[PDB]
Amino acid sequence: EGVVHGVATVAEKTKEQVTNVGGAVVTGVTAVAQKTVEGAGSIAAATGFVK
Amino acid sequence: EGVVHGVATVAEKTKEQVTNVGGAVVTGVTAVAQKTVEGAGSIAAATGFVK
Amino acid sequence: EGVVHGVATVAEKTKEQVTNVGGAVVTGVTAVAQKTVEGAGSIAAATGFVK
Amino acid sequence: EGVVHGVATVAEKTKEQVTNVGGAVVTGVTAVAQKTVEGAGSIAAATGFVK
Amino acid sequence: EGVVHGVATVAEKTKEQVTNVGGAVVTGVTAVAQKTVEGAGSIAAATGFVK
Amino acid sequence: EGVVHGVATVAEKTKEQVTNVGGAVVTGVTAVAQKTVEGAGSIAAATGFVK
Amino acid sequence: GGAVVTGVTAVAQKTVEGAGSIAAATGFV
Amino acid sequence: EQVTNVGGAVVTGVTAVAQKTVEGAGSIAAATGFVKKD
Amino acid sequence: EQVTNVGGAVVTGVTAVAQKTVEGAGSIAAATGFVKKD
Amino acid sequence: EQVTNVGGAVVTGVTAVAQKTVEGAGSIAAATGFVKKD
Amino acid sequence: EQVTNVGGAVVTGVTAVAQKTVEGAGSIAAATGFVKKD
Amino acid sequence: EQVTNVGGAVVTGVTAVAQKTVEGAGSIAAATGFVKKD
């Protein structure tokens, strides 16, 4: 049935070289954030700088 | 059935070298953020700078 | 049945070298955030800087 | 039946090396954050800087 | 039946080496955060900096 | 039947090496934070910095 | 070969579904 | 066969900031002060 | 067969920072003070 | 068959910091003070 | 067959902090002061 | 078959900390000052 409303991601990390010798690095494998609804309902959101 | 509303992604990371010497870098494998709806409903969102 | 509303992610870490000498590093495997509803309901959320 | 509303993640750690001499490193396998409702309910959540 | 509302996570640790000599390291396997309701219920959660 | 609302996580540790001489290390497997209500009830939780 | 940098500010960020503001400046004399 | 040889690697005074944010907000502000009088 | 060779690796005065945030907020601010009088 | 060779690895004075936050908030502020008179 | 070879590994004056937070709040503030007169 | 080879491994003055928080709050602040006059 695969994926209906969500998303699908596949990855294979065979060989990677990362040398951190002069700074800072951040890396990641597929972080996700999800807001979904099926029927009657309401998702109200304010994400960011709101003040 | 594959994908109905969301998207699909495949990425095989075979061989990669990144050299961090004169600064900083960020990268990752396909982060995603999703909002979808099936029937009657509402997603009311404001993302960014709102003030 | 796969995934209906959520998302699907697969990753394989075969060989990876990270050498952290000239600074700091952060990395992760698929952290997730999820808010969903099925029927008549309400998720109301404000995430970030609200003031 | 797989997963209905939540998300699905699989990872395999075959071989990974992290050496950290001149800084700090944080890493992890799939931390999760989830809020969900089924029927007549409500989730109200302000996460971040609220003031 | 798999998982209905929660999430699914599988990870295998074949071979990994963390060598940390001149800094601090933190790592872990799948810490989770969850708040869910089924029927007539409510969750109100302010997390972060609230003041 | 798996898990209805809770989450599912499996992990195997074949071989992992940690060495720490001049810093701090913390390692963990499946730390849990959960709150769940099914019928008539509620949960109010403010966690973090409240002042 | 040489890799000699005088003095540097370096900024990198990725944001998905939010907002981010970078503000950097260097002082060299 | 992928190889990298860093010969000198001499960077004197640096500020380096990286961040990743999903579903939120993050603002970063950095500044360097360098003076090589001689 | 991948190989990294770092010859010198000399970085004198540095501040470095990375962070990841999912479903929240995070602001970092850094600054360096360097003076090489000689 | 991957290999790392760090020849010198000399980083005089640094501050470094990383963090991951899921479902919360985290703000950091760092700064270095360096003076190499010579 | 992966191997790490650190030749020099010299970091004179450093401070480093890392944290992970799930469902909470955490703020860190670090600083260094180094003076190598010679 | 992975091996660890640390040749020099010299850290003069350091201060490092790490923490993990699940369902709570945790904030630390640390700093170092080193003076290598010579």
Author numbering:
A (entry chain E), B (entry chain G), C (entry chain D), D (entry chain C), E (entry chain B), F (entry chain A): 46 to 96
G (entry chain L): 67 to 95
H (entry chain K), I (entry chain J), J (entry chain I), K (entry chain H), L (entry chain F): 61 to 98
Quote the study on this structure.
Out of the three ∆N-constructs studied, 41‒140 fibrils had the most homogenous population, and thus, the fibril structure of 41‒140 was successfully determined by cryo-EM at near-atomic resolution. Interestingly, the density map of cryo-EM three-dimensional (3D) reconstruction shows two asymmetrical protofilaments intertwining into a left-handed helix with the helical twist of −1.64° with a half pitch ∼52 nm, similar to our negative-stain TEM. The fibril structure was determined at an overall resolution of 3.2 Å, with clear side-chain density that permitted unambiguous de novo atomic model building. A different number of residues was resolved for the two asymmetric protofilaments, comprising residues E46‒K96 and E61‒D98 for chains A and B, respectively. Chain A folds into a β-strand–rich architecture including the β-arch kernel (E57–T72) that is present in other full-length α-syn structures. Chain B adopts a dramatically different β-hairpin conformation. Unlike chain A, the lack of density for N-terminal residues G41–K60 suggests conformational flexibility in this region for this protomer. The β-arch motif in chain A is stabilized by a previously documented intramolecular salt bridge between K58 and E61 (24, 31, 37, 38) and hydrogen-bonding between H50 and E83. An intermolecular salt bridge is formed by K80 in chain A and E83 in chain B, an interaction not observed in other structures. Additional hydrogen-bonding is found between the two Q62 residues. This interface has a calculated buried surface area of 442 Å2 with an estimated total binding energy of −7.87 kcal/mol which is nearly twice of that of the steric zipper between residues H50 and E57 in the full-length protein (239 Å2 and −4.49 kcal/mol).
pmcAmyloid formation of α-synuclein (α-syn) is a pathological feature of Parkinson’s disease (PD), multiple-system atrophy (MSA), and dementia with Lewy bodies. An abundant presynaptic protein, α-syn is 140 amino acids in length with a putative biological function in aiding the exocytosis of synaptic vesicles, in which the first 89 N-terminal residues fold into a helical structure upon membrane association. In its disease-associated, aggregated amyloid state, residues 37 through 97 adopt β-sheet structure, which overlaps with the lipid-binding domain. Notably, both N- and C-terminal α-syn truncations are associated with PD.
